[PDB]
Amino acid sequence: KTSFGSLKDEDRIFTNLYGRHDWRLKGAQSRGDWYKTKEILLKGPDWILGEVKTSGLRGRGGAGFPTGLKWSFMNKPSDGRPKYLVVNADEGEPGTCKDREIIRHDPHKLVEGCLVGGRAMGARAAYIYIRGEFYNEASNLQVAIREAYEAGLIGKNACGSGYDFDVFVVRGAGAYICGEETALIESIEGKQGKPRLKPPFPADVGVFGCPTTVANVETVAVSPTICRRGGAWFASFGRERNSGTKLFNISGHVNNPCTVEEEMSVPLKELIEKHAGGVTGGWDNLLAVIPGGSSTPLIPKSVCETVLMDFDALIQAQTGLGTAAVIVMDRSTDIVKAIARLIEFYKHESCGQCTPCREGVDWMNKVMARFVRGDARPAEIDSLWEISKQIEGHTICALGDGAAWPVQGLIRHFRPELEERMQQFAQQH
């Protein structure tokens, strides 16, 4: 195939995405959840890891690592320590709200995913770390977990398969950095959410010091369907190495901001028009799009004309798919102010552990605030580029990179706007 999109409802995974059908166990089973889970578990971890491998699934949390290979790090003999699956429901990336819909409207997909994914890793339990602001969603998930326990689908002898598995829910307390895998582990352990250096990797030393795999909610929630329908069925969607369906969030200056499931490698233009009702004021009114949440560099309208929404396509456009949270800005937007507010966000979210982000991001925030008013000289633009490069790749965790990249996208594509603002300020003063 060479064209992508127009996913049919028969091939959509999250069929209760909009919560118009019963989200509890009875509705979930009627939609195909918890069907033949016992057979899947009895197939074995290597079979399950094979299907996730053949499916081409990649991490939906933002980094996009191949899921089958990543999960196989746990497929090793035990050494006396328990093994854990940690499901990342921190959902903190600005623009991203897909995981919220899964937890509250399709909770049993996530619960079954924990069991199937946990079985592949040989984990004894799953901890679902959900951000503390998602109180009503956590309670929904807690109700679904109780139904699964009462029905015998999880817990002792889960699904009558002779495999024990617990699913715990632990809430955050307000921290974007606790979405980072190792910071999430540190938070579960009762410490400040500060990322760990690697090595060790979590598959060797993770939560409570034990072998751990951290997986995104969407990554986990689709695994049971991949096992039932096959990895080949999943890989028949999207371009090579960009397999499967993807949940998108389209927000900002669109007519009907929404969440939707669509094929990977759908054209960005087609996604915005078919599902979000087009750019506010027409496509000609488009200024820039942030395609994968605040951490991904923006792209100008010219690039958005033909780009495809998948990992490889957006990398060649000098950005990334990220969480696939599309933030649309029309030509009435103050683009410098829009980006400056994201840097302010990263300033408020940096854990402060390591020097380049603790000091660099606060420094970038001060410079951007002046760039908004034009109270700077053009020589500071190349200075700000260099500062962002001193943060990128020098910090413990990827938040520092996530703050550097949006600044780089602004300078790459809107340098004339920044310079024009400094010229206007100078004549006014």
Partner: protein, 43 residues
């Protein structure tokens, strides 16, 4: 078959202790926890 009403309305009646009450309810379903061997890293 209806597709025109919202079927996620239970959370309009959740309260301060809803989440922890459910956690207390689930306590009898869990497998026994593993042990590091000591009461804490400071023991």
């Amino acid at each position: 078959f209806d597709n025109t009403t919202y079927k996620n309305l239970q959370h309009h009646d959740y309260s301060t202790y809803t989440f922890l009450d459910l956690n207390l309810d689930l306590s009898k379903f869990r497998m026994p926890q593993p042990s590091s061997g000591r009461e804490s890293p400071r023991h």
